[PDB]
Amino acid sequence: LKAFSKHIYNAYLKNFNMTKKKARSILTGKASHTAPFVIHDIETLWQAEKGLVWKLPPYKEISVHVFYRCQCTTVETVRELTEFAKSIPSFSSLFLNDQVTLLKYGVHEAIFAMLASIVNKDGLLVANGSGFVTREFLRSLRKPFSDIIEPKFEFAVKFNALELDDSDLALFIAAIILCGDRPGLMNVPRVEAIQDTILRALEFHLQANHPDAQQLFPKLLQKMADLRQLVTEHAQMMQRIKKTETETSLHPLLQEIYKDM
């Protein structure tokens, strides 16, 4: 359980460029990091696109452009999560179609959980910590686009109050992905068995890492339930956009995820 935990933690370190530790020293102005360029209005968003942060489909409008940048980040994160998941021997022994089912229904729960690592009450890191976008700027955009990020901030700040670290997060994200009750899963008993091992490891770890945090394990099982519901709401928002924002482009991978939800 301890060697198991360490292995998943190494896979997490190996596969995610931004960790919470890195994100926190950037956000607190630690000596070994260059400060991010702050995106707080339309002119700074435009400067960031010119080269101060970033070196997409045809430009439509400000709100849509921000949406396109949201898609770039989540699709890149899906890439990192796939590699992370593959780095767990038990995951890679599953038939490839089961691996796809798990990632399809698990990646957004994992994304919204990890998002908390790069967030404070004022905004979020973007572009590998090279930028900071303000929560206020995001709320200012047109209706469907402002409404989709705000609930993630809301979840994140309460989640952040639990004070997890990267070693905790490794096990938590592994438990999210390796979930046996996903629709269309083929070998349910094997996946459920892998997941309980991960969960046991997580409880074993939290006892050592957070000794005075009695109730932390059941608190986290509830966050998994909350994430499932936050993704259900997000998929409905995404379907509305597809239906009503017909000039707005959506990445083919994302179309494949939200199909059937």
Ligand SMILES: CCCCCC/C=C\CCCCCCCCCC(=O)O
């Ligand atoms: C300049 C704008 C930078 C982008 C800010 C958002 C970046 C990361 C947050 C990821 C969650 C955003 C929620 C919207 C996700 C829509 C795409 C998807 O569903 O995959």
Ligand SMILES: CCCCCCCO[C@@H]1O[C@H](CO)[C@@H](O)[C@H](O)[C@H]1O
């Ligand atoms: C390891 C070899 C892979 C064999 C491929 C078997 C194809 O199964 C397909 O897997 C998909 C989930 O991933 C589902 O969306 C489809 O409904 C299902 O038909």
Ligand SMILES: CCCCCCCO[C@@H]1O[C@H](CO)[C@@H](O)[C@H](O)[C@H]1O
């Ligand atoms: C690595 C990216 C994670 C994969 C997420 C996308 C999963 O899409 C699914 O892929 C299957 C083909 O394999 C299709 O049968 C399903 O219709 C489709 O919904």
Ligand SMILES: [Ca+2]
């Ligand atoms: Ca389970």
